[model samples]
Target: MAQPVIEFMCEVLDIRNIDEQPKPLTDSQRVRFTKEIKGLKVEVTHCGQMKRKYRVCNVTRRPASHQTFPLQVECTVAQYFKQKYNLQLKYPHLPCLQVGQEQKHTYLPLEVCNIVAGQR
Candidate 1:
């Protein structure tokens, strides 16, 4: 049985010992971050009561403020969240997690996800 502990994604990333400055990730930093988070489970927190869990598939090369996805039109992750959830991102400078299938283009900001505890 797994414990029902929840940890913020930021805290998990901090355990990786990467620089947490509000800046874009370097090439090696990106690789390290990706390697650390790939295949981990995360639950989104910005959607009010509906917390959706997803498996982290990849990390975007660009920060959430610059990484764009196609909706009605191309919009950055930060803009999408702001418009949909009316929530401003706390870490727009951080890269997003490409969750679920790679083809679905499901991007999630690190600040909005929580790690489901008890999984190694």
Candidate 2:
């Protein structure tokens, strides 16, 4: 069975919360972090294809949004769907997964924690 990368990292890193300010992983810890995760399995739900299972070649980091789903997507089709939906609007305020620091701050919300797939 595949699992979320964050969950695997937490157990390997021995950290309870990922949101806390912490030092970078030493060279040894860093390799272990990447190695252990690469060997594990993962699953991702694609947009409009959430019910299907897909395989991923490797892990790649991307910026996660800290707001509600954009209203533009379904605005014309479902008119009020965006305005009526409030599902995870406050998720950005909660704990999120941060892979690394880059040009922009990235976050992984709980909804897709187990959604990134990697072939085992």
Candidate 3:
């Protein structure tokens, strides 16, 4: 079985502020804060010869936001996260994955943590 889980991650992006800050992320310090979770999969199916439909699956559970990644990388990494995730992630007070809103920012899913007690 594929199991009910998936991990999410993206390549590192530039953090311009890091360089100008009192301390900056070392070459190896940079990292993407995407989320990875395991849950019943959301699959899509074809209903007609030339038609397709997607099943969003039940949100019977959810992941705790922080478990994913920091809302948005420091402003410096904003663009990188945007391009890599194909989104216009606006860095807010909290990590986005933790507190996702259907409006504005899109793409990065708001995965609820421990939905299945994680790797139970």
Candidate 4:
């Protein structure tokens, strides 16, 4: 079954309870998290009925709320999602996925991405 990337990460890290306000991963936890998720396929969940799939290239060091990327004006991933999709992220503390290309800076919040079923 398809599940949010945060849920999968919780399982991977042996976190027993899934919390609404998920905590940020520590440095070592982040390393392991990145190792486990890299290259797995995931689908975006923020686009309503329309889905776009991407492969996990890397994990961001900062959470979506803090991760900044270049734009006309530099903005955080969370801000961009709010402005463009009008969707406020629930788990802004969780890291993001650097999908598509490593050089392109296409980041997707982990909470907005579901792991493609049968990819593990």
The clash count for each model shown is 0, 1, 14, 0
Number of the top-ranking candidate, with lDDT as the measure: 4
Q: After superposing candidate 3, which stretches have Cα over 4 Å from the reference?
A: 1-75, 95-116
Candidate 2 local lDDT, 17-75, one digit each (tens): 66573343455654555555543334442233454332222232221232322343522
Predicted structure 1, TM vs. truth: 0.80
> What C-alpha lDDT values do all the predictions have?
0.75, 0.40, 0.27, 0.88
Worst 10 residues of 3 by lDDT: 58-67
Off by over 4 Å in 2: 22-27, 45-120
- Global fold similarity of model 3 (TM-score): 0.19
Question: What is candidate 4's CA lDDT for residue 44?
Answer: 91
Ranking by TM-score: 4, 1, 2, 3
lDDT of 1 at 68: 92
Please report the candidate that would top TM-score against the real structure: 4
If scored against the real structure, what TM-score would every candidate get?
0.80, 0.38, 0.19, 0.90
Residue 95 error, candidate 3, Å = 4.7
Each prediction's Cα RMSD?
A: 4.1, 8.9, 15.6, 2.0
Question: What local lDDT score does residue 49 receive in model 1, on the 0 to 100 scale?
Answer: 72
What is the Cα-based lDDT of residue 41 in candidate 2?
34
Better of 1 and 2 by lDDT: 1
